[PDB]
Amino acid sequence: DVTRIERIGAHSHIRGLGLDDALEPRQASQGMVGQLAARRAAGVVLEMIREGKIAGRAVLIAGQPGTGKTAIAMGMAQALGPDTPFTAIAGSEIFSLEMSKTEALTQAFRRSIGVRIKEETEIIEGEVVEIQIDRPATGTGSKVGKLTLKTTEMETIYDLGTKMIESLTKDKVQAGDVITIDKATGKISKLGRSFTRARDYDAMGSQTKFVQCPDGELQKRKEVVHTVSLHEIDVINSRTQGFLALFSGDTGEIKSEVREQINAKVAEWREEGKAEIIPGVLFIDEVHMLDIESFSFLNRALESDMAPVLIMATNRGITRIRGTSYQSPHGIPIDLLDRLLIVSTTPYSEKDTKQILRIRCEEEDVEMSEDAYTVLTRIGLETSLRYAIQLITAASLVCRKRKGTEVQVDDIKRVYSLFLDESRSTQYMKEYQDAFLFN
Amino acid sequence: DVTRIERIGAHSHIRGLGLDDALEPRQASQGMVGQLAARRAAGVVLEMIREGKIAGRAVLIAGQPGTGKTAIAMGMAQALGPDTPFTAIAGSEIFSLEMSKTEALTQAFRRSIGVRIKEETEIIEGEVVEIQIDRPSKVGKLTLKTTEMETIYDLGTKMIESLTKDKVQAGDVITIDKATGKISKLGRSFTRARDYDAMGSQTKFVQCPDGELQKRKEVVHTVSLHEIDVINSRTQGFLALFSGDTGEIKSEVREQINAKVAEWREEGKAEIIPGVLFIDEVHMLDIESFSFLNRALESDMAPVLIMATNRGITRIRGTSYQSPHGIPIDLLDRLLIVSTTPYSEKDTKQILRIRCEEEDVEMSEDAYTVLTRIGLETSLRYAIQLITAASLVCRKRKGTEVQVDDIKRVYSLFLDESRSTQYMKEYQDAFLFN
Amino acid sequence: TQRIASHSHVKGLGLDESGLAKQAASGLVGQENAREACGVIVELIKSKKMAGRAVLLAGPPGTGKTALALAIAQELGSKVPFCPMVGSEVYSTEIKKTEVLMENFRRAIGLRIKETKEVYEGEVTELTPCETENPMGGYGKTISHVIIGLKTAKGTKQLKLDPSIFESLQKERVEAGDVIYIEANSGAVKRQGRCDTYATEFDLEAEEYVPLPKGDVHKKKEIIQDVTLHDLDVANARPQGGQDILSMMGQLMKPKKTEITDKLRGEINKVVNKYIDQGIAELVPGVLFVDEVHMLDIECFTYLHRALESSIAPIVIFASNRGNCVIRGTEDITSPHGIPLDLLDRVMIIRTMLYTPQEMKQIIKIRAQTEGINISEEALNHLGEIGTKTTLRYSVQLLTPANLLAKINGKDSIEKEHVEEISELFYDAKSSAKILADQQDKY
Amino acid sequence: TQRIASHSHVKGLGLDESGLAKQAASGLVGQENAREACGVIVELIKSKKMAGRAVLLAGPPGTGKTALALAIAQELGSKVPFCPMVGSEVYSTEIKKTEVLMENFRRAIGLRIKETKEVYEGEVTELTPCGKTISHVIIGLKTAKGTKQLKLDPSIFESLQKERVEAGDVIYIEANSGAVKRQGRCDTYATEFDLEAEEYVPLPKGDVHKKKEIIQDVTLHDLDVANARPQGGQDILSMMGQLMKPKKTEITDKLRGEINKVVNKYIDQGIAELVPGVLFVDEVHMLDIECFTYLHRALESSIAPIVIFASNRGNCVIRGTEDITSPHGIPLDLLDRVMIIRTMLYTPQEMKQIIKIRAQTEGINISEEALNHLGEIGTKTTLRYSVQLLTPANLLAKINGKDSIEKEHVEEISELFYDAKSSAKILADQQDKY
Amino acid sequence: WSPFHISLKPYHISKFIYRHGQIRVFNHSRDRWLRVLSPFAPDYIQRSLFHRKGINEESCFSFLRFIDISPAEMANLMLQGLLARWLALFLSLKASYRLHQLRSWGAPEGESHQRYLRNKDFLLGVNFPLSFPNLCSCPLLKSLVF
Amino acid sequence: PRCSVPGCPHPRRYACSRTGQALCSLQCYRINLQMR
Ligand SMILES: Nc1ncnc2c1ncn2[C@@H]1O[C@H](COP(=O)(O)OP(=O)(O)OP(=O)(O)O)[C@@H](O)[C@H]1O
Ligand SMILES: Nc1ncnc2c1ncn2[C@@H]1O[C@H](COP(=O)(O)OP(=O)(O)O)[C@@H](O)[C@H]1O
């Protein structure tokens, strides 16, 4: 019933590369199907990413439009899991107005290296039974006070310090609030009121849902793991109180003197055992958009020991490298193309095309007759795969409009007449040719 | 004697758009001459503007150089009058260095819609004569004077603080919005321009106010819809009205103002006076900006557009593509084209007579005859410039009415395009580049 | 009353319950296969299942693809976000093209998040710090509560309050006869001003007197608040909470769009999923509509590849009037509808067709009766014949100037002789282009 | 002394009282037809009635276009604004192109504002404040010419108190501006301590009280700028003004509407008078098509200055049109709005007079046997090259211990510094080594 | 460890340039006329605002009847620089909480005769659900603006 | 409090500086200045 922020996208059915533990691709597994050569190869680079021993590695996934290049990349992003940073960038996105192209790549690189910090501290977690705050009549003006805390098992009294007092009164904690204090830092946090004070109260000074009193021992430890990437370590260090720039995107062109200092101090946090630097992946999707200026930065950024692995996708033949007249393979300059490994995808068979449409209907919660899958496979070979994929939704919606339980071949023949393939729209554009503009 | 800041420019003479009640144009009136069909079309869009009933209508006034297209738009701006907005821009004014081509057009649209509002007021307005305060909480008494009356106010605690923080003294002139209690000094009375003999850099002397002292009245206000957008763009956004220091106002602000201003006309609190946006030289608009006008012409608070253009089948800016007027076909059918026509000798006389009537010049009828040939042979806007120079030559010569010889003298001094290009083609290898 | 726009008659798609198109309904006519296609797209959007699926309405100028894209907004109604754009909006001077697209993608997804508002308010008739019968040991006196005597036009009622409230009433300047409010969820007390009851007690006093509240001293409602995820992007990217030096400096500096990080998108998604799972926030995924899509740069089209495939994205409606144009931001590369073939492969194209003479007549009638105009049938037959020789737009546009001319000539309806006058006063693109070609050396 | 410049010899058009040109006068020679045309333009600018009317000085490099535009500036003198700009100044990076034109159009319209500058200065003999707080402050001032007392307002006393003034300080007070400067302690107190960290100035050997009727010059652009953004507001004496650096900004056309409506309110009172001036858009061929197209509004507008363009380009491409050739590098649509003045290559005798006028301005004595050679070398090259040889030739003559040019000095300089056409031959020969 | 603490000789400005060379000083008598001819003078604001001639008439400062701003508040805010800007901002932050609880509960009847715009009716930026007064008033949204 | 011109129903707005009576308009100021 309820619908979350992430929904059925173009790749939502992909859940990994579908390799076995001997690294062979299965014919259909984890949502991926067919495409054996490129999935096998992506398995080797995925294992190289997860091994993490070597920096400055680049992979280009290449082949016809609609042949699983982005599927493999958005697929290994799932098999690598959420605990290790994978950054998806379209090659269009480095063209900033806050910063140069070589800055936007230096950020996309460094945002793809994690510094996994495990933080642990003692917390005090209890229902507040009372607060005493004492204030002198004028004098030097130093406040002093006490706090009493309770669990379902336990109780104690704390003679408070001065900095604790200003935090407790800033956060307006009151008797019957349940709170969780970081004993290492003096930060309060509030869970809500305990149920017990429905009997005696004032006219409402606060209102919320109630929460149960905390259980067990009053003092308990907490563990957090932060996957803070190098780019956000640079931003935090770029100026004092810089923290909002992590969200706001505000910092352009951070000083080299900051980065070369973070590259030293993160190495020290590795050697101290203070933080786990984890290499990630930068996926520069549609990389044929990079200017030759940006590619020449990729020649030499890609050779620091702080470089991530990077993966690229392209669907371009011999074409002019963007920003020049020079023709080259993939629209990538040979300076970079010599420096990387090329994984080449393959067009689909009937068997694979039908099997993609079959896993797609299983993600979309659609039933189709085997007759309907047959016609849709023919449509997805005569036209591109992405058109046939899209007709599944429209055919299920037309079927639901006639109150059908299963999509039939005549729902697909209907939808095929209703929404055009490019190759058919581009044909009708010949018979109305004078009416469309700027032919 | 005295020279005003606004004086005799190229369109100054056309004080309106000469039309009978039936929208039949007069052959010459309100300074305009000829162009009968284009002036009916201008009159019909002028009544469409005065109605305000329908939105995003656009007229392209098109025709050869000198054929009155900006004249019709300026004569129409005068005939529409004040009290209904008429934003005029050259099409090259939208190319800002601090906001997009979308924004400069969106502001130019929004600045042509007038929200007209009623507001209810009472303001005290007078010279303060003296202030009395006791020393207990305080209850002061303060005297206001105006040329008609001398009066005293019993005044409250916060007022005594406000008057002494604003440092009022006897002989200051002040106002106070009573609904809000905010004081405002205007200056010191001219009757008081001597109780000091060296005075602070922001003192100003003003007349002692007159009429009733606490005027209670409603006042109408007209606010261009753009100002409501600017005021809501950032906290002290009104400073950016004057500074120009605003750009890229959020779409969520503009669509909030639309919903709110719609709510005010539904409540009857305010009424929307749709003005005109005039884009002279609209062929300077980029393809990325014509394609914005396409969806701009569809809001129920788009202005009526008027445009002028002066281009054959020509390349649209930012493209390889030839089109009529240098405007995309996907805009030109949203437009409704008005075509201006070259002048006859009969019309070229009457317009040169009306420019001389504006410039305060007398010419011999033979001088109008020779000048009319010069304007017919070279360009109307050249003959309109010779008459001032001919007046100055005639004044220097101690004459009074410009003679044929004064026209021939000016014509020997100041060249048009065609003679100047001939002399350039004779001396050619001395000029740089071609 | 409201003023009529180029689309004010479009009230919906006018479909049957079976999803077929009626000949003329909801202020549309014709285009039946494209109206039926938009019927499937309304179900696509109302299902809330899909993300980033996209359609391209492709057809000549004046054929109705902006009317159909707006008809979808009427079939959906105001409950879900429909976010109109032109391709030309991406060329901001403050923020990169691709982020303007990402902001417009994030505008087309709405939370619909609901909560209680509760406030205590009124004229304060007393503030009685109320003592215990005796002090605690070693103390002179103890206040167990303040009593605040709030009044409104419904009545007076005392509120018992925590003693700490006095150490905020004297941080304000609250005195008896002020009107005040207290946020019941937060316990902060705020002063509005002296009540209007006292507006006569001086000839001048330096405060705006506030009218006495009506309804009870204690007010409650639940309210439904709808915010786009782009409102959440902005409010986190540029905080408004004033009392920090960087909040004030950030509010005195010029406002700016800024290149919001994928991390803020991630963190917002990670919290709205918390509130969708807890049932506190509904979601209404909606529509991004881009008209004039052929104005996007090839970097923008190549950004739409990632954006449309993304599992978060809205349904996208593209519209284009172009033939085989060059893709903007490439020199020589001609491509159908002005869109790269590898974007044009990702979209369900809907063919929008030229009108037959009778459909133009039927549209001109529907314009006239919603533009507020009466036209004679012989004038309408002539105006449909003008339309057939020109465009739907020009023949529709002759209506209001023909009504002005009829009204000026003292008649309540457009006659034959009115339309042929306006047709001679005002030219169309086809007739004007002939004049420019005949006068070629004079412009 | 002053520095000699590329035009410091031209002192006027040199026309006679009939408006015809003298052969050589006011530092100009030759060029009679263009000088007579500029005579009419000086009468036009002196007549004040006209707005936006414009002139193009057209003709080859080194033919006097900028000398005649500066001759117009000298015929009018400092009393009327002459604003020079290059067309290249339009390419700002803080504001749009079509704003820089409007700023410079607003610099060329002046206000003339008389006031009686009223200065008091001297040793402060006493400060005595007198309402119960400060009604006024009596101050006493002394000089070696006498003594006075002034009745200062409290805002001037705040300024004395900000200047940290005490009895015995030497102060400058200006009674119009309310300006105050402490100048030092009066040196009669220089023995008050043997070292104190102050400067002691002698008691002024001048009047306690001085008057001038000063006659201030200010331009509408000074008003536009000083009213658009919030002022710096404080006499330094602040640190908020450290944070926000200034920038040039797109001053809105709606502010200029109010500045015009306010200046009309003051010139009606006779408090100010208007001086319509000249904008000299020098090298106008360097404007872009968007700048040129904005002039098709700015030359029409009823407020605008007179505008003098200059150009030396042939039938070249219009800057920013990527293709379109047009005479003088200006669009035909603008070239149909300007009165063109031709400019001509001189005969050798007319160059020889300029060489002597340059020599006798530039401080050079020159013998006829060398002046004949500079006249000849002008015909072998260009006028500006001959003129440029004078100081070098005199400077070799001075090193050679001689009071004048003789043939061998100019002959040596000719063989030492090449002209633009003899050097082009060297580059055409050694083509493979540059 | 601590950063290298360089200090340069101070930038030497002569008594001559300090006395005569500051345009703020030597043009002070001219800079006054830029202020006397200012439309922000409270006299001209009042005269532009309330003493209009037309039954309908366009004038600037019409918005000062719908923002809270007084004519002398606008003059002081324009002529007294970034300090007066800052103080006027801090008081507008305070005033927004007073405006919001009016704006969100005073819904019935109307402000007068169901016509006339009231003072502050152009301050619309409080009506956004995510505006700081509303975000402080409603406790749930405060956690989405984290 | 009300205007002290005896026929006048309006609230007090201000007082006469000469005679000390409460007033509400110029008409009541002129009338009060007559009847004293
Ligand atoms: N009476 C004169 N007649 C013509 N030119 C003169 C005269 N007096 C001075 N000049 C000369 O003008 C020359 C420089 O300005 P000039 O107007 O010739 O520049 P230009 O090349 O024609 O135009 P521009 O300033 O656009 O480059 C100097 O050599 C100066 O001696
Ligand atoms: N091997 C695959 N397994 C599963 N789905 C695939 C596979 N190859 C392509 N698809 C699907 O086909 C569509 C287009 O493929 P995609 O990789 O996104 O295109 P492209 O190769 O141009 O980058 C997507 O919906 C994708 O999931």
Ligand SMILES: Nc1ncnc2c1ncn2[C@@H]1O[C@H](COP(=O)(O)OP(=O)(O)O)[C@@H](O)[C@H]1O
């Ligand atoms: N019909 C007219 N009536 C009065 N003045 C006219 C008319 N037509 C042209 N003019 C005058 O001729 C000059 C140029 O006309 P304008 O409309 O500005 O030319 P264009 O259409 O090419 O831009 C102006 O002085 C203008 O007032």
Ligand SMILES: Nc1ncnc2c1ncn2[C@@H]1O[C@H](COP(=O)(O)OP(=O)(O)O)[C@@H](O)[C@H]1O
């Ligand atoms: N099918 C339709 N039924 C009724 N009116 C229509 C229809 N299609 C178009 N219109 C009318 O014709 C106008 C032109 O269509 P529009 O969508 O604006 O053209 P375009 O396809 O080029 O964007 C619309 O604004 C509307 O007034």
